[model samples]
Target: SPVPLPSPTSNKQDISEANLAYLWPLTVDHGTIECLPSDNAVFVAPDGTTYALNDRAEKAGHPPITPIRAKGSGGGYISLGALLSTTLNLCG
Candidate 1:
């Protein structure tokens, strides 16, 4: 009626490495306290210290602002980490 306590021979714990690195983060990456404006904004607001990047938009010039980020009708929002810590659980 017993597994004989703490089983020292068990090397099964190493199996966690796949999920270990994953769960260790516990939340999404990509954030910057260095660039955010006002009390933990969802995105960087142009509040003087930051560049509004008007040239970043109306620039009919070089590179087109890197990876389709035109900050207009284009896709550009200084996004933060979206927490999924409990959004979808296996429910096991």
Candidate 2:
């Protein structure tokens, strides 16, 4: 869940530094994967709702939901340190 960010104040430097703690680059790869359809596309949500990107988008209204991270099977928003290093090599 996204936490409430601290209110921005007149001090620009302070705000910028504080915001950095909550940001990172979303590096997306347009490469193919060994998974079905050959596209590295999937969505994993906090509610344990996993779906193929396109399939989810096709649902009527698509009701708003928070995805832990929108990425391929072995891609970004990773938390496993050792697994990440190994998967990083296999990803791209």
Candidate 3:
């Protein structure tokens, strides 16, 4: 299953920057999309927003993780936004 994010509501939304930060949390200062190693899942904010990393993972590839992966067995991690775009053939 995938979470849906609407296109920018304003010209200043900067989807590109949002995608970039969401993809790599360590590289940015103002946003965070925390992925818990224990679950191999990203947390959503209280405001119906998924973790910042989840947004990126969605854009990347929503690689559904097995319990083993979620429990930190595999060395795989991905951006949710990137995953969604790649899976759905979205250029963005």
Task: Specify the poorest-scoring 10-residue window by lDDT in model 1.
Answer: 83-92
* Candidate 1: Cα lDDT at 32: 16
Q: Tell me how far the alpha carbon of residue 42 in candidate 3 is from the true structure, in angstroms, after superposition.
A: 1.0
Order the numbered candidates by TM-score, best leading: 2, 3, 1
Q: Which 10-residue span in candidate 3 carries the lowest summed lDDT?
A: 64-73
* Residue 61's lDDT in candidate 1: 27
Cα lDDT tens digits, model 1, 41-79, are: 111122312211123222322122123222323633431
lDDT of each: 0.22, 0.29, 0.34
Error of 3 at 80 (Å): 2.8
At residue 2, candidate 3 shows an lDDT of 28
lDDT of 2 by residue, 1-92 (tens): 11123542221111121333433222332211111223222333334443333333325333222343344467655332232222223333
User: lDDT of candidate 1 vs native?
Assistant: 0.22
lDDT of 3 by residue, 1-92 (tens): 22244552221122333564335322223322333332233433334444323334544554322221211137454334453333233222
The top-ranked prediction according to lDDT is 3
Q: In terms of TM-score, which candidate is stronger, 2 or 3? A: 2
Q: lDDT of candidate 2?
A: 0.29
